[PDB]
Request: fold
Amino acid sequence: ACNVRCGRGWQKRSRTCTNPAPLNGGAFCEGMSVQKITCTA
Amino acid sequence: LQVCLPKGPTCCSRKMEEKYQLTARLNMEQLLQSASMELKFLIIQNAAVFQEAFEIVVRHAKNYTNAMFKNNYPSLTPQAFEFVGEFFTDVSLYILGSDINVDDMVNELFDSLFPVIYTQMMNPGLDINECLRGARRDLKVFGSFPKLIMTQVSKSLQVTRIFLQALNLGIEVINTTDHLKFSKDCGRMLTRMWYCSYCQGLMMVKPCGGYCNVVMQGCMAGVVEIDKYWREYILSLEELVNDMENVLLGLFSTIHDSIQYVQKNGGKLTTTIGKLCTLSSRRRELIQKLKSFINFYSALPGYICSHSPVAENDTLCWNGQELVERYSQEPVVSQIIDKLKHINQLLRTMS
Amino acid sequence: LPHFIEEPEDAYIIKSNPIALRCKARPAMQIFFKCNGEWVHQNEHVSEESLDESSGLKVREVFINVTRQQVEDFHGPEDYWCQCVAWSHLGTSKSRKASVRIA
Ligand SMILES: *[C@@H]1O[C@H](CO)[C@@H](O)[C@H](O)[C@H]1NC(C)=O
Ligand SMILES: *[C@@H]1O[C@H](CO)[C@@H](O)[C@H](O)[C@H]1NC(C)=O
Reply:
């Protein structure tokens, strides 16, 4: 939900590296983990 | 029919039996998800919170290092900002599990720091840069400061990395629980226990408590074996919590003192080089809340029977084939146990 | 409407050297930057009131500095992008989205 009621707000979307989680030195997920967009409420 | 044992007539065909089997599968998955949801959300919340808190600590430390460079060594900026940013970027990348060498972080930090110190602080006035980078390590200009920082930060960063990996693997196995596919024989036994009473024309009759017990202990024989390793996982995590906020926050004093240390022998160094060239509270509450779920795998069949409609009295109940007065009486599990053994060894070795 | 002559091209920060973004349109009376959805402060804009030789009309060129600290502290979903909005007596016009990234 847009944190700010009036004007510029925020919307977040998480993307975790857990399907599957790296083991015994496996290469971790490449790129960004969070997504944030400006919203007008 | 292949599930409903026909003792008398029957009100259901083979297709209705398949529908009952699929509804049994879905009901079992719903019950497992309801059992695992609270713990899954607990570990997800804590993983997210600890990740953000560690990132806040790293950001504050990078900010203070940049600010202390701006204030005490303006002659080293803006190059100081470059190597500080690279150092703390590699710090965060290591915390989040990327293949980063801690000794290499510290060594590249001091390799970048020494030439600007020499050119701007010691001998005021691009190609000779590599000669200075080599002389940094060949003449041991920073003394034991690089190894001190190396051990200081490797010790904390490895325990934090393994803490986050442990949280993630707990999330993984708790997500796996509610997706556990069972045997065909168990599918048919669950269909008999939950629905085959409807095929005999009964409307509100529930299965016997003892019949639910035998069925559940029948198909959860593998899942119950996870309880030992899950208990060891909880206790090893408790062993680990009992590191990294304090260390990263004292780094600035150590770096300032190392710069002083190098400037202390400038006389000989310049001539030689000219010739040659609330966190702990959170993890405590997390462990105290996680110890409430140590019985999760052992209490799971009890949960399935206590949350399914059953006749606890074992009177006027469904026994899977008839209404009685009294009741008569690997691979995915292997992967879960493999990963639990691995994470438990990794935990125990840290503390 | 305003026609852009010099549309902003995607810049790249090298060795913490802040590279400014160029914007030139005619006919234009107000030119502003919208970096990552929100307006850029008036102080950051540097306007130039030019006159074209090919045609006697009011041209406007605005430059805005983008520092490394701005990109490295931006934690949004997409690449640090900026857009140019020009005002005319008839309406407004948007330009290309130049994404400044820490190479
Ligand atoms: C960032 O730098 C400022 C200026 O010295 C300081 O007040 C603030 O505490 C720092 N923040 C972080 C995240 O380090
Ligand atoms: C932005 O600031 C930097 C200072 O390092 C400079 O190199 C660049 O040319 C500047 N652009 C401006 C002031 O609009």
